[PDB]
Design a protein around this ligand. Structure first.
Ligand SMILES: Cc1ncc(COP(=O)(O)O)c(C)c1O
Ligand SMILES: Cc1ncc(COP(=O)(O)O)c(C)c1O
Lengths: 438, 441
């Protein structure tokens, strides 16, 4: 029952230490919760164990990065093998080639790739590649979508409630002291609203190096880009020489060939991370050989220099190769089957109870919603204070009933999970829903 | 065995042919490309790196100073293997982040609080972002010709234009293609080790400057440190104007138990770190005064500067970094500094005996060979002529063929598996490489 909140808990003592040497005891904003979060001690398979000994089924998995759960034996074997050879070198290795070979074989848009140390870095380097390829300074992204901590990609991460006078989204700062020149350089588009998107892209078509889009953004309720919208976005970006960048840092796990394969639209660049590293720090930017040529150093200095001390380090390469090789087509099918079972079970729980709600998701990703507004209008994804309080009561009850999910009730399956784990989630959700309503 | 990887049908040639189909020019890290194709690392042990063609060399690069304990260090490997049984990443904080933060703040005086990132590039970016959030100001200042990673604002003028503008100050020059004019306009480029021009430029831009970012001993400028009077006056003027002073110690932190800032006696507001502090695993960190780092504090409301990161403070990096740093004791710093002095003196003697003009800079376990006698205190002297580039290239290629792996600039670093035998092997190989480069027996 959430024993970590108790005075004198292990988590409380750890937080007391942490706040002396980390700001507010924190080094990752995402994992803070008030007054202090629980601390992880270890994990095994689908189970996370906190510093106070409480065990929970992990439906977060480091925000979808650990598709194979905790301490996967195959990844551990591969990493242990690599440790004997060394973990980083100032020379390329074959391991970077092998993972690049896998990624380019699986994702149709990927003809060549480069590895980075984070999804944030992958997004930055795709933007910089688009600037180098097109010569143009500005980028466009969609209101309310998260892409990491790079200045230009994080503009309007949190939508302002209201459009400007033109009726279009407002470029709003996500970090303090954001330069006006940064805000002014970013065109903020409305997700799944093709008319406004087309009008804004047309207005800025000569200044836009790229459009950056997450195909199934978690921050907008995990409702995917609709097919007509995404096909018209592809057509207009191609028409105006604008690089289309897909942010699949989360969504790549939707399918053997990524969400771009699911939706049938081929971007010019793709940013990736999380699962492709086997649990170790990683990102990747890839796409057409034509656009990726900005990085090519063989014909003189590259148009876009891309250094990095731990780029393509063999630990990350070996772990990611192992993680991806374990993701066979049949494994994707199993994940999608279990995800469908979870989402349908949660919908039946909502129906049987008196609670209006809906569940979005695809493959092994899901998002529970305690309202029935159409998420095809992205402004409907914003929650009121009462709705936030209700979701929070459900989340805390779940935490106390052995289920670890994000505060928004966005979650993911891990390959160690089966029907028992899904049933455990659905039963715990029924009980937590009852708790939250009193 | 004389650079066998360059032969047709070598392992490296086959690997390059595969690589260029799936990587741009077969490359994923610009630094490690060399023409026509680079050698490929197969494995390492202690101070020795072994390439895919079986050729072994003493490693004086160590992933650009990150692996201060050399290859496959057993203590780091044992700690990592212990952690693997527990899991490698979590969506909760762990005690391991606390342990490494406790060590770093205990050792470096300016570090009151820290946050971990996944690269030195990220550390530099988040330091710049923290300074903007703390001061509210949009622009930053950095020094001409200095490298800080791939973040847009930090990389302006990484390669100097070579000549000043009409005002006599350095030029804000693009390092990547398509750099927006607004990015160039937001960066004030200062002259390293020229306190007069530095002060005049900061004075001119004092109301718009959130931060001055400075590498205390930049490799790009020949590894000649910021001189004490220059750095003290920089500290005074930034403090007077409310400008955040950021040290980039991603490389220089290894100079001393308390960093190069402790050597030079100047307390920055923030420090960016990386490389050694991760034990060989991807890592960065930004730390400093609790006053400035409070922009990150999420208690008591939303943080002024949000800072997420899926792999931030992952337990593998935290455990490997804790082990690596715990092994770097005061006695180890002393031993590395003695070995570095011995190497540098040996190289100076080789140059003197050969009649070849040159000099060697360095500190602790870092060194830089120069095949000229220009005073590097004038930073524009660090730029090499065509003749110097060709001659240094001959020396580097000969060293590579003589069992020595060093950077093309002849910038190098020691590792803890090294002793006097490795230093003497370096000095002997350098003498032979100099003879080769001059065409002498
Ligand atoms: C869609 C998306 N883009 C970018 C990132 C940033 O990746 P990282 O946390 O590794 O910097 C994340 C986490 C993400 O979900
Ligand atoms: C002085 C300096 N700053 C920043 C970096 C960037 O670190 P990373 O390669 O890990 O991004 C490097 C390599 C460096 O030498």
């Amino acid at each position: 029952g959430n024993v970590y909140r108790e005075p004198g808990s292990a988590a409380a003592d750890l937080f007391e230490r942490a706040r002396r040497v980390l700001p507010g005891g924190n080094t990752r904003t995402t994992v803070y919760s008030a007054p202090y979060p629980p601390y992880a001690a270890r994990g095994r398979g689908a189970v996370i164990v906190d510093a106070d000994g409480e065990e929970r089924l992990d439906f977060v998995n480091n925000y979808t990065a650990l598709i194979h759960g905790h301490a996967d034996p195959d990844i551990n074997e591969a990493v242990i093998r690599q440790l004997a050879d060394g973990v980083a070198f100032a020379m390329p290795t074959e391991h970077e080639i092998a993972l690049a070979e896998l990624l380019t074989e699986r994702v149709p848009s990927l003809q060549q790739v480069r590895f980075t140390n984070s999804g944030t870095e992958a997004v930055m380097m795709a933007i910089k590649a688009a600037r180098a390829y097109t010569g143009r300074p500005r980028i466009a992204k969609f209101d309310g979508c998260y892409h990491g901590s790079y200045d230009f990609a994080e503009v309007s991460t949190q939508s302002s409630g209201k459009p400007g006078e033109d009726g279009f989204p407002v470029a709003t700062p996500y970090t303090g002291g954001t330069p006006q020149a940064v805000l002014d350089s970013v065109v903020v588009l409305p997700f799944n609203d093709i008319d406004g998107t087309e009008r804004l892209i047309e207005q800025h078509r000569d200044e836009l190096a790229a459009v950056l889009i997450d195909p199934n953004p978690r921050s907008l309720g995990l409702y995917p880009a609709e097919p007509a919208f995404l096909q018209r976005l592809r057509e207009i970006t191609r028409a105006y020489g604008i690089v289309l960048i897909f942010d699949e840092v989360i969504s790549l796990r939707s399918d053997y060939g990524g969400m771009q394969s699911v939706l049938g639209v081929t971007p010019d660049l793709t940013a990736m991370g999380k699962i492709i590293g086997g649990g170790f720090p990683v990102g990747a930017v890839g796409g057409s050989a034509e656009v990726m040529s900005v990085f090519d150093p063989t014909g003189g200095p590259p148009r876009a220099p891309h250094g990095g001390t731990f780029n393509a380090n063999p630990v990350t390469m070996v772990a990611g190769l192992t993680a991806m090789r374990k993701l066979t087509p049949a494994e994707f099918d199993r994940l999608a089957t279990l995800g469908q079972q979870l989402r349908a079970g949660v919908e039946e729980v909502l129906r049987e109870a008196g609670v209006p709600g809906q569940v979005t998701g695809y493959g092994s990703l899901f998002h529970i919603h305690l309202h029935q507004r159409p998420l095809a209008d992205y402004r409907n994804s914003v929650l009121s204070a009462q709705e936030r309080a209700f979701v929070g009561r459900v989340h805390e009850a779940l935490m106390g009933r052995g289920i670890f999910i994000t505060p928004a009730l966005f979650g993911c399956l891990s390959t160690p999970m089966g029907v028992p784990e899904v049933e455990a989630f659905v039963d715990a959700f029924a009980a937590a829903l009852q708790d939250a309503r009193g």
